[PDB]
């Protein structure tokens, strides 16, 4: 098992992210536009699917 | 307490909205016990609050509990 606080710390770096719908890039949780140039800085973002 | 007749058992499983009561000084008389526990500038504020407090009962006949309290035309006591 993993201590509850440690599991929260690790999840911040690889679980709470936004995903672009055009180039599958990882984005910050509060982002509004993709940062990559090959997708044209698109603003079609979706949350990262949770584990359940 | 001012409810339609008795609240007989095994009758509250279905809708129990048959609690209509009359709107008169009987409800106003019961307001004197509280006596405006929190300020309210004596029973004058409490009477308006208590009158509209029974909003489910919809007062008596055509008159509505909100209209009586909203219309400041009745005597203080």
């Amino acid at each position: 098992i993993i201590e509850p606080s440690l599991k929260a710390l690790a999840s911040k770096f690889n679980c709470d992210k936004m995903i672009c719908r055009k180039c599958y890039a990882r984005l910050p949780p509060r982002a509004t536009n993709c940062r990559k140039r090959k997708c044209g800085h698109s603003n079609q973002l979706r949350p990262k699917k949770k584990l359940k | 307490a001012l409810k339609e007749p008795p609240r007989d058992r095994k009758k509250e499983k279905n809708i129990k909205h048959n609690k209509s009561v009359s709107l008169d000084e009987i409800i106003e008389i019961a307001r004197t016990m509280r006596f405006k526990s929190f300020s309210k500038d004596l029973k004058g504020g409490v009477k308006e609050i208590l009158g509209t407090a029974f909003s489910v009962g919809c007062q008596v006949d055509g008159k509505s509990p909100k209209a009586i309290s909203d219309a400041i035309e009745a005597g203080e006591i």
């Binding site: 098992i1 993993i2 440690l6 599991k7 710390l9 690790a10 999840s11 770096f13 690889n14 679980c15 949770k50 584990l51 | -």
Partner: protein
């Protein structure tokens, strides 16, 4: 649209000295000395008052003015580091296989080296060497901590990121395998 005058100010406490020459900044105080080169930015440095440094840009564009605030905080970071230092903390996160580290001392030079063993039960021994001026310690306050401290924020932070980026899980669901070493707190040595 070009802006005529954009200005910022940096206060200087009465403990250290700073000197700028040919856009090369040298900051020296009680805890040491640092240098930074800013020859790639067109900025005019000046002495506003007895203990205040001013900097400004004339007839700049929107893109050029943006760098003005970036320069100010970088120099402020240098002042903080020489009088208060910096301090980072890291934690170990494992489910089954314990992670073993060995922070051996100076290797005939100022550099520290960190050895990481038994990551998710692998036989690699993986080695990272820290930048000079950075000291790595095993904490005694509580279990599973790495403490990094130094004078410059850029060196301390980049070295800490080196350790985090080296412990990676491949060909697995990373939402389930949360193994690794992560940073958890940032602050100064003093207070």
């Amino acid at each position: 649209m070009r802006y005529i005058h954009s200005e910022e100010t940096i206060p200087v406490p009465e403990n250290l000295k700073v000197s700028i020459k040919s856009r090369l900044v040298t900051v020296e105080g009680p805890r040491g000395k640092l240098q930074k080169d800013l020859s790639h930015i067109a900025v005019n440095f000046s002495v506003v008052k007895k203990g205040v440094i001013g900097l400004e840009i004339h007839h700049g564009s929107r893109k050029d003015v943006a760098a003005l605030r970036t320069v100010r905080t970088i120099i402020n970071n240098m002042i903080i580091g020489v009088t208060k230092g910096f301090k980072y903390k890291m934690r170990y996160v494992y489910a089954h296989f314990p992670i073993n580290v060995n922070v051996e001392k100076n290797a005939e030079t100022g550099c520290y080296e960190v050895e990481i063993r038994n990551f998710i039960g692998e036989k690699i021994v993986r080695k990272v060497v820290m930048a000079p001026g950075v000291e790595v310690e095993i904490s005694k306050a509580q279990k599973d901590e790495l403490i990094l401290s130094g004078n410059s924020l850029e060196a301390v932070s980049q070295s800490a990121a080196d350790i985090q980026q080296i412990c990676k899980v491949r060909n697995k669901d990373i939402r389930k395998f949360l193994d690794g070493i992560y940073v958890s707190e940032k602050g100064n040595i003093v207070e």
